[PDB]
Amino acid sequence: NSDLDVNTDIYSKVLVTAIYLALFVVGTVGNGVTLFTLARKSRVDYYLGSLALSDLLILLFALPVDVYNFIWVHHPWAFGDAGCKGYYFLREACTYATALNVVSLSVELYLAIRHPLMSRSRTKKFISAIWLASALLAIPMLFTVGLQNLSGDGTHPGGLVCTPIVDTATLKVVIQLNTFMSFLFPMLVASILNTVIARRLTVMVHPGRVQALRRGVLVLRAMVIAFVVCWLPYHVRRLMFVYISDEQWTTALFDFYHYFYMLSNALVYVSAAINPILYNLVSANFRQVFLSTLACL
């Protein structure tokens, strides 16, 4: 089954791998210590913790499977049907949860800057609601991807790959679903909200709350722009994967699709690693307790 092979150079594999491992350690340590101190510590801490969990899931259970079975060995898939579906399901649920957390944070900040409720119980209930909804919107992937023997006769175990098992139309529908619901719409809402939040901050600012508020505004805007920039090439690739006709696909577009895969996923991990570092760059006491928690290791 030499038709399933790709020609991505070794140096690119090693480079992208090294990047993935760097983002792995930075992201896991960052979000791990983040969850640690946040748990040891306030309304936004639940959203931040939710984000940290969302990132940790990808960094721990999606990153190794990716770096192994997607850039190093393209075939055969060695995680089974359950691993195949559970992987993409996890990814989708994660991106949905992240997006919804961002938008929710935008709303919370706007309300905390326009009028300066949501008790601890109610807030946690709402976070649970976000997670559940995220899991619900990730369901189609369980019915979209799967295992297929793409070898010449469909009998060779080396041709057992993890590929979408549904037709082009349905694939279009689910990919569009993900792109609209987890990217365009929510980040649009969050961008508008951030836009209003900025000027509201400028008009409010004309004692110690306004500085933390400014901090929150900058952090939030940073998270939004990071989300857009990082998740942009990701959604373009998935649309590129399906919308291009089978006759239009050439070897150049193939190899380029794989390099683009490397790039896009690299940025995807860059986001998950960029979440906690932004919390440190504000020079808040969070960085102090970050070094404090990082020291005892």
Binding site: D3, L4, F70, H74, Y88, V145, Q148, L150, V161, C162, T163, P164, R238, F241, D246, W249, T250, T251, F254, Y257, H258, Y261
Partner: peptide, 7 residues
């Protein structure tokens, strides 16, 4: 000629 199988 050939189409990707990785999503």
């Amino acid at each position: 000629g050939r189409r990707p199988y990785i999503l």
